[PDB]
């Protein structure tokens, strides 16, 4: 023997070429590897079994799969300390000939599926994550949806079933036990439908006996290997039936959500593969999302979701390699925005519920009776994140706080104003002081622009929330060990340098990220560096463009729909011109409007003049000057004031 | 501004309030009343005008 | 009024090459070490030895508001007979003095001085304001010589609004209707701040900016990105791979076998060794960073659409500005015609306008785009041909609108009327 | 100049108007240049100064780009 980029739904990184069962092979390239090496060693007996081991070796200068042909005596344990004994024997043997994996296959007469034992690693320890399971089947069950995670496989009566206790890597307060199941189809319309609820029950008896114990959350992902004729909206219609029978069992072994994975050729035919996510949120499900398994163009399968649903639950146009997050995981980021003196970017949502539920509380005390339009604590606002599509063209999400993709994150609002009790809608944009210091990237331009331009088109006014470092800042990080240099004396460098070349095998490396002249010194084929170009975006001149396309939005904005920023935190370079362009604009008293460094122009004049941002940035001079309008004592009482505007 | 629009004089009429310059309340309470004999005479003046349009494009 | 169309949306008072011909090489080159009056650039520089011309005509630059903010220079001038609007950066250290107030007895005279290549309060407002007098009843082309390393970040600046004042040529550039040529000339620079009130993306349909082969152009200086993104560690790593003295004193430290008096040597003989090869390391980072700032990158990224020979800059510009002319009138022509009544980082001024992509087949040139010699000559030749095809649009227009006028009821109803 | 946005017996409208009374705006001393200290400056009520005529023009700006506000 291996794609690795257009192969079966997966992940892949700059140059790499992993295995489907060992996740994590060698990503350095494999343009420098041995090939892959499959062999197949049917044994009558479990002892006899040692004989075409020791000999079968021989033969080898990769995998190795050992079939058993005795259906008669099924161990369990006792077929652990009967294959264990051969591997610690021959531990030098398997480990000589670089053999990464070792499979056993074990089938029975009366049609149940084989039994698999895989050995990997060094020493080869026994993964008991991958059992009675193939390295073909090791793609569907993915186990790439839990690497944020630490797992311990437990023991299954049923060898389709596989159960893991997962807890997470970073705390330990997260304990969860995902259920990962195979489905292969019967040889030779309501199959399906019975085939769910024999699995389902089948997984329901196992989570019994291993008991619920102390779980937060439980999961169970289900994959089908047979391509039937599956019409999506007869089969929601029949998923509503079974799930409210199994349910109450599923709610008390704290099962919280359902995965499925079904083909259906009904589109030979093509066969689109339609995912569905059932959560059990607030009590009862009301959760039913059909999504479509389709590629994002980028080389990632993502979850489009045409759900049965209201079109406002979670998770939407992600790709297929999600890790399932874990409790606790939000506050790290929150602490980097915090030390800062500015609220973590998805709290603010929250933030504006409040000053709107406060906006509802004093209006009703003013204008006593007229008040019974109030719409509670919550369904105060009704959010929902944006993130560009496909084609650059953006879309309402309702996926988790966080996992944004860019340094830049807009969410449209449809808030219950005392003024428009029925509903009213803007565009709320936020830089994320946590993500790269906050700095604008050609990303973060080509979506604050999109950003202002549906504003524009909607007449809904846009709120800016800034919190930045102005444009991203550059050098290129691959070129900084391979490039040589040229001197005019080679014993002492001191004595000045010609100029700067790269080696020739150094040059064939990049010839792209740098533009190279030939010129022969020393009777070396030298390449002088005569423009950096660097693989990596983001470093000089691509961010100004953004930056001044953006700049001239927000000029062009403000004279159509209603602009307003709010420094939330240190606002510099292109980031505090938005403010001006903005025009009407919030300053929290310690978050400054700076354009230059305060230690930048000491160095610049030598001497040590200023001693902080705020010294030249602060309210005493933006406010004193007519850049702020208002001055707010915290990030919700800017929040509190824009509300009033 | 009581000469601020050469449509006043064609909206004055249709209203039909003597103190239509003045009377700033008597008017208010009026577009209230009659917001739906605004918007039948807005569509009658639209047919009109969608009429005379066909006779510029050609001329 | 020599410069100005004699009516409103009338074309500009052009005539023949004749004195200074469009066919001569820009002969006054700037120098790199100090600063040159940047009027030399535009006009020409009267020396000694002989004259040296520059871009423009021979004496056909007239600057105004040459009493404030003298940190650039405004004004109107002749490109082989075409007049346009020029604004230049000036490189030299000017010093305003304000006067002393009579009213208070306790004000002096303020000796303030504008270095050079920046933009103030007073130089961001005279950029503003000669942008709106040069589209506003003026309509005319503009050339800017782009040198600003960005803006004046001082206390005092910031206090008096330097921020306001800077955002005003942003919203004066989208008001533009003219061609616009943002041109980095030899030895110009433009960082951070200054840029991005300047990019083409700001009014797509009117702006196209070009750089000179030997101008700079990044987010900061490359002695401003080296303390950041090059600091001392990653400068070692780099001198521990380079330098051979360096790498084989980096051996004796990772063998051990030595004792205290012994590892002490290694390191008194090394923190002395990088205490010499710090001020060239630290060169050879900067030039590494200017590769970065370099006018190929800025091709490479597409902020640019050419590098420009500073040589042969009025030879390319008396075409460009002549091909624009010609072509935004028939665009705008076009349009009239059409609706008798840009979106992107992508968008570049040759996917200005939808038009041009019909307007490209009706010509039937090749190289469209480019050859702006070419382009010209043809419309010059095909003046009927054009009033041909605008006449056969007008009257294909004016089918889908009379087809236009639930209207159908309507009709029918104003009709048997 | 006072600037600022009221409501009318329910409708939301746009505000200016003139202070009477002798404000005095007190410019910080340049840390740049160490011969300069903080300006004292009374703006006398009722008149108009660079600073005011930007403010006001401004304002209305505001009050009608986006906002389209009564003044």
């Given at each position: 023997?291996?794609?690795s980029?257009?192969?079966?739904p997966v992940?892949?990184?700059?140059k790499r070429?992993?295995?489907?069962?060992?996740?994590?092979y060698?990503?350095?390239?494999?343009?420098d590897?041995?090939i892959?090496?499959?062999?197949?060693?049917?044994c009558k007996d479990?002892?006899?079994?040692?004989?075409?081991?020791?000999?079968?070796?021989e033969?080898?200068?990769?995998?190795?799969?050992?079939?058993?042909?005795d259906?008669?005596?099924?161990?369990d344990?006792?077929?652990?300390?009967?294959?264990?004994?051969?591997?610690?024997?021959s531990?030098?043997?398997?480990?000589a000939?670089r053999?990464?994996?070792?499979?056993?296959?074990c089938?029975?007469?009366?049609?149940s599926?084989?039994?698999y034992?895989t050995?990997?690693g060094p020493?080869?320890?026994?993964?008991?994550s991958?059992?009675?399971i193939?390295?073909?089947?090791?793609?569907?069950?993915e186990?790439?949806?839990?690497?944020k995670?630490?797992?311990?496989p437990?023991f299954?009566q049923?060898?389709?079933?596989?159960?893991?206790?997962?807890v997470?890597r970073?705390?330990?307060?997260?304990?969860?036990?995902?259920?990962?199941?195979?489905?292969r189809?019967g040889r030779?319309?309501?199959?399906?439908?019975?085939?769910?609820d024999?699995?389902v029950?089948?997984?329901?008896?196992?989570?019994?006996?291993?008991?619920?114990n102390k779980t937060?959350?439980?999961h169970?992902?289900?994959?089908?290997?047979?391509?039937?004729?599956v019409?999506?909206d007869?089969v929601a219609?029949?998923?509503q039936?079974?799930?409210?029978?199994?349910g109450?069992?599923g709610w008390?072994?704290?099962?919280?959500?359902?995965?499925?994975?079904?083909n259906?050729?009904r589109?030979?035919n093509?066969?689109?593969?339609?995912?569905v996510?059932?959560?059990?949120?607030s009590?009862?499900?009301?959760?039913?999302?059909?999504?479509?398994e389709?590629?994002?163009?980028?080389?990632?399968?993502?979850?489009?979701y045409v759900?049965?649903n209201?079109?406002?639950g979670?998770?939407?146009?992600?790709?297929?390699s999600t890790?399932?997050p874990?409790?606790?995981?939000?506050?790290?980021?929150?602490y980097?925005?915090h030390?800062?003196?500015?609220?973590?970017v998805?709290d603010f949502?929250?933030?504006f519920r409040?000053?709107?539920?406060?906006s509802?509380t004093?209006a009703?005390?003013?204008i006593?009776s007229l008040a019974?339009k109030?719409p509670?604590i919550?369904?105060?606002?009704?959010?929902?994140?944006?993130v560009?599509?496909?084609?650059?063209?953006?879309?309402?999400v309702?996926?988790?706080?966080?996992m944004?993709?860019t340094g830049?994150?807009?969410?449209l609002?449809?808030?219950?104003?005392?003024?428009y009790?029925?509903?009213?809608?803007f565009?709320?944009?936020?830089?994320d002081?946590?993500?790269?210091?906050?700095?604008?990237?050609?990303?973060?331009?080509?979506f604050?622009?999109?950003?202002?331009?549906?504003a524009?088109?909607?007449?809904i006014p846009?709120?800016?929330?800034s919190?930045?470092?102005?444009?991203?800042?550059?050098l290129?990080?691959?070129?900084?060990p391979?490039?040589?240099?040229?001197?005019?004396?080679?014993?002492?460098?001191?004595?000045?340098?010609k100029?700067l070349?790269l080696?020739?095998?150094?040059?064939?490396r990049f010839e792209?990220?740098?533009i190279?002249e030939?010129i022969?010194?020393?009777?070396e084929?030298?390449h002088?560096?005569?423009?950096?170009?660097?693989?990596?975006?983001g470093?000089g001149v691509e961010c100004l463009?953004?930056?001044?396309?953006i700049?001239?939005?927000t000029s062009?904005?403000?004279?159509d729909?209603?602009?307003?920023t709010?420094?939330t935190?240190?606002?510099?370079?292109?980031?505090?011109?938005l403010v001006?362009?903005?025009?009407?604009?919030?300053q929290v008293?310690?978050?400054?409007?700076?354009?230059?460094?305060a230690?930048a122009?000491?160095?610049?004049l030598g001497?040590?003049?200023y001693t902080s941002n705020?010294?030249?940035?602060?309210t005493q001079i933006?406010?004193?000057?007519?850049?702020?309008?208002?001055?707010?004592k915290?990030?919700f009482?800017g929040?509190?004031?824009?509300?009033?505007? | 501004?009581?000469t601020?629009?050469?449509?006043?004089?064609?909206?004055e009429?249709?209203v039909?309030?003597?103190?239509?310059k003045?009377?700033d309340?008597?008017?208010?309470?009026?577009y209230?009343?009659?917001?739906?004999?605004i918007?039948?005479?807005?569509?009658?003046?639209?047919?009109?005008?969608?009429?005379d349009?066909?006779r510029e494009?050609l001329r | 009024?020599?410069?100005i169309?004699?009516?409103?949306?009338?074309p500009?008072?052009?005539?023949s090459?004749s004195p200074?011909?469009?066919?001569?090489?820009?002969?006054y080159?700037?120098?790199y070490?100090?600063?040159?009056?940047?009027?030399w650039?535009?006009?020409?520089?009267?020396?000694?030895d002989?004259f040296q011309?520059?871009?423009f005509d021979?004496?056909?630059?007239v600057?105004?508001l040459?009493?404030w903010?003298?940190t650039?220079?405004?004004?109107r001038?002749?490109?082989?007979g075409?007049?346009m609007?020029?604004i230049?950066?000036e490189?030299?250290?000017?010093?305003?003095?304000?006067?002393?107030?009579?009213?208070?007895?306790?004000?002096?005279?303020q000796?303030?001085?504008?270095?050079?290549?920046?933009?103030?309060p007073?130089?961001?407002?005279?950029?503003?304001?000669?942008?709106?007098?040069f589209?506003?009843?003026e309509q005319?082309?503009?050339?800017?010589?782009?040198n600003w390393?960005?803006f004046?970040g001082?206390?005092?600046d910031?206090?008096?609004?330097?921020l306001?004042?800077?955002?005003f040529?942003?919203?004066?550039?989208?008001?533009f209707?003219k061609?616009?040529?943002?041109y980095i000339?030899?030895?110009?620079?433009?960082?951070?701040g200054?840029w991005?009130v300047?990019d083409?993306t700001?009014?797509?349909?009117?702006?196209?900016m070009?750089?000179?082969?030997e101008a700079?152009g990044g987010?900061?200086?490359?002695?401003?990105i080296?303390?950041?993104?090059?600091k001392?560690d990653?400068?070692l790593?780099?001198?521990?791979?380079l330098?051979?003295?360096?790498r084989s004193?980096?051996?004796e430290m990772?063998?051990?076998?030595?004792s205290?008096?012994?590892?002490?040597?290694?390191?008194?003989?090394?923190?002395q060794?990088?205490?010499?090869?710090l001020?060239?390391?630290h060169?050879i980072?900067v030039?590494?960073?200017?590769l970065?700032?370099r006018?190929?990158?800025?091709?490479?990224?597409?902020?640019?659409?050419?590098?420009?020979?500073?040589?042969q800059?009025?030879?390319?510009f008396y075409?460009?500005?002549?091909?624009?002319?010609?072509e935004?009138?028939?665009?705008?022509?076009?349009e009239?015609?059409?609706?008798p009544a840009?979106?992107?980082?992508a968008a570049?001024?040759?996917?200005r306008?939808?038009?041009?992509v019909?307007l490209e087949?009706?010509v039937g040139?090749?190289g469209?785009?480019?050859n702006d010699?070419?382009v010209?000559e043809?419309?010059?030749q095909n003046?009927?041909r054009?009033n041909?095809?605008?006449?056969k649009?007008?009257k294909?227009?004016?089918?889908?609108?009379?087809?236009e006028?639930?209207?159908?009821?309507?009709?029918?109803?104003?009709?048997?009327?």
């Amino acid at each position: 023997f291996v794609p690795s980029s257009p192969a079966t739904p997966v992940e892949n990184d700059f140059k790499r070429i992993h295995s489907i069962s060992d996740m994590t092979y060698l990503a350095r390239r494999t343009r420098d590897e041995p090939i892959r090496k499959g062999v197949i060693v049917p044994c009558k007996d479990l002892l006899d079994a040692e004989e075409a081991l020791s000999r079968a070796l021989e033969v080898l200068p990769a995998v190795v799969n050992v079939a058993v042909r005795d259906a008669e005596g099924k161990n369990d344990e006792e077929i652990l300390a009967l294959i264990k004994p051969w591997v610690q024997n021959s531990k030098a043997d398997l480990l000589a000939r670089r053999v990464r994996r070792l499979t056993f296959i074990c089938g029975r007469n009366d049609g149940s599926y084989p039994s698999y034992y895989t050995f990997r690693g060094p020493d080869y320890a026994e993964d008991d994550s991958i059992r009675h399971i193939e390295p073909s089947l090791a793609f569907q069950l993915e186990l790439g949806r839990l690497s944020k995670f630490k797992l311990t496989p437990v023991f299954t009566q049923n060898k389709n079933i596989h159960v893991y206790e997962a807890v997470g890597r970073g705390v330990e307060t997260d304990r969860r036990y995902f259920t990962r199941a195979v489905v292969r189809p019967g040889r030779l319309a309501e199959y399906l439908i019975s085939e769910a609820d024999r699995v389902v029950n089948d997984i329901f008896d196992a989570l019994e006996i291993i008991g619920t114990n102390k779980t937060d959350l439980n999961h169970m992902f289900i994959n089908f290997s047979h391509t039937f004729q599956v019409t999506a909206d007869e089969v929601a219609e029949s998923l509503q039936g079974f799930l409210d029978r199994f349910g109450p069992r599923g709610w008390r072994l704290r099962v919280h959500q359902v995965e499925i994975r079904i083909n259906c050729m009904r589109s030979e035919n093509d066969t689109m593969p339609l995912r569905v996510i059932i959560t059990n949120t607030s009590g009862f499900v009301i959760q039913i999302e059909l999504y479509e398994e389709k590629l994002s163009e980028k080389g990632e399968w993502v979850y489009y979701y045409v759900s049965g649903n209201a079109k406002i639950g979670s998770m939407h146009l992600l790709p297929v390699s999600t890790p399932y997050p874990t409790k606790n995981w939000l506050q790290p980021k929150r602490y980097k925005a915090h030390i800062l003196g500015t609220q973590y970017v998805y709290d603010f949502p929250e933030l504006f519920r409040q000053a709107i539920q406060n906006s509802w509380t004093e209006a009703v005390k003013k204008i006593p009776s007229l008040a019974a339009k109030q719409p509670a604590i919550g369904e105060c606002i009704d959010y929902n994140e944006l993130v560009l599509g496909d084609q650059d063209n953006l879309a309402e999400v309702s996926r988790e706080p966080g996992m944004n993709s860019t340094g830049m994150v807009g969410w449209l609002i449809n808030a219950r104003t005392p003024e428009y009790p029925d509903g009213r809608k803007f565009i709320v944009v936020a830089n994320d002081i946590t993500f790269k210091i906050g700095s604008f990237g050609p990303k973060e331009d080509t979506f604050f622009f999109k950003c202002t331009e549906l504003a524009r088109k909607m007449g809904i006014p846009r709120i800016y929330l800034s919190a930045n470092s102005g444009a991203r800042l550059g050098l290129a990080e691959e070129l900084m060990p391979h490039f040589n240099v040229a001197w005019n004396d080679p014993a002492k460098p001191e004595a000045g340098f010609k100029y700067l070349y790269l080696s020739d095998e150094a040059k064939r490396r990049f010839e792209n990220e740098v533009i190279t002249e030939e010129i022969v010194e020393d009777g070396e084929k030298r390449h002088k560096i005569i423009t950096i170009v660097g693989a990596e975006e983001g470093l000089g001149v691509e961010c100004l463009r953004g930056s001044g396309l953006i700049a001239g939005a927000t000029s062009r904005a403000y004279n159509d729909i209603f602009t307003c920023t709010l420094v939330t935190c240190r606002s510099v370079g292109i980031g505090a011109y938005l403010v001006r362009l903005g025009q009407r604009a919030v300053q929290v008293e310690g978050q400054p409007i700076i354009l230059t460094g305060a230690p930048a122009l000491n160095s610049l004049l030598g001497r040590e003049v200023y001693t902080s941002n705020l010294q030249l940035g602060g309210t005493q001079i933006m406010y004193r000057n007519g850049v702020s309008h208002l001055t707010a004592k915290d990030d919700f009482d800017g929040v509190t004031k824009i509300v009033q505007w | 501004p009581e000469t601020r629009s050469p449509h006043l004089v064609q909206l004055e009429s249709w209203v039909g309030i003597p103190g239509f310059k003045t009377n700033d309340r008597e008017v208010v309470e009026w577009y209230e009343q009659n917001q739906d004999r605004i918007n039948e005479k807005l569509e009658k003046l639209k047919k009109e005008s969608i009429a005379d349009q066909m006779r510029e494009l050609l001329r | 009024l020599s410069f100005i169309p004699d009516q409103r949306n009338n074309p500009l008072p052009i005539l023949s090459p004749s004195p200074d011909p469009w066919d001569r090489d820009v002969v006054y080159t700037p120098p790199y070490k100090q600063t040159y009056d940047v009027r030399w650039m535009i006009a020409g520089k009267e020396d000694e030895d002989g004259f040296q011309p520059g871009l423009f005509d021979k004496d056909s630059f007239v600057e105004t508001l040459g009493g404030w903010a003298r940190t650039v220079v405004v004004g109107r001038a002749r490109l082989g007979g075409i007049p346009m609007g020029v604004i230049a950066v000036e490189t030299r250290t000017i010093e305003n003095i304000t006067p002393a107030d009579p009213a208070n007895p306790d004000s002096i005279e303020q000796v303030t001085n504008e270095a050079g290549g920046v933009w103030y309060p007073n130089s961001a407002f005279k950029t503003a304001q000669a942008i709106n007098d040069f589209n506003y009843g003026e309509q005319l082309p503009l050339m800017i010589l782009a040198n600003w390393r960005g803006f004046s970040g001082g206390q005092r600046d910031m206090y008096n609004e330097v921020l306001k004042y800077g955002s005003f040529i942003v919203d004066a550039l989208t008001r533009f209707e003219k061609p616009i040529f943002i041109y980095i000339p030899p030895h110009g620079e433009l960082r951070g701040g200054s840029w991005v009130v300047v990019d083409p993306t700001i009014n797509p349909a009117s702006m196209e900016m070009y750089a000179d082969e030997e101008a700079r152009g990044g987010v900061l200086e490359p002695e401003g990105i080296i303390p950041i993104k090059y600091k001392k560690d990653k400068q070692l790593e780099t001198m521990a791979r380079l330098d051979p003295v360096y790498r084989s004193l980096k051996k004796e430290m990772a063998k051990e076998g030595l004792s205290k008096e012994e590892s002490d040597n290694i390191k008194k003989k090394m923190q002395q060794r990088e205490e010499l090869l710090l001020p060239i390391y630290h060169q050879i980072c900067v030039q590494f960073a200017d590769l970065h700032d370099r006018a190929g990158r800025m091709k490479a990224k597409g902020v640019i659409r050419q590098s420009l020979q500073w040589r042969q800059s009025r030879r390319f510009f008396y075409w460009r500005v002549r091909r624009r002319l010609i072509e935004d009138d028939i665009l705008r022509r076009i349009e009239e015609a059409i609706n008798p009544a840009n979106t992107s980082l992508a968008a570049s001024p040759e996917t200005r306008s939808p038009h041009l992509v019909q307007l490209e087949s009706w010509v039937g040139i090749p190289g469209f785009k480019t050859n702006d010699r070419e382009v010209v000559e043809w419309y010059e030749q095909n003046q009927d041909r054009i009033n041909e095809k605008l006449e056969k649009l007008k009257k294909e227009s004016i089918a889908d609108q009379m087809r236009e006028l639930x209207x159908x009821x309507x009709x029918x109803x104003x009709x048997x009327x």
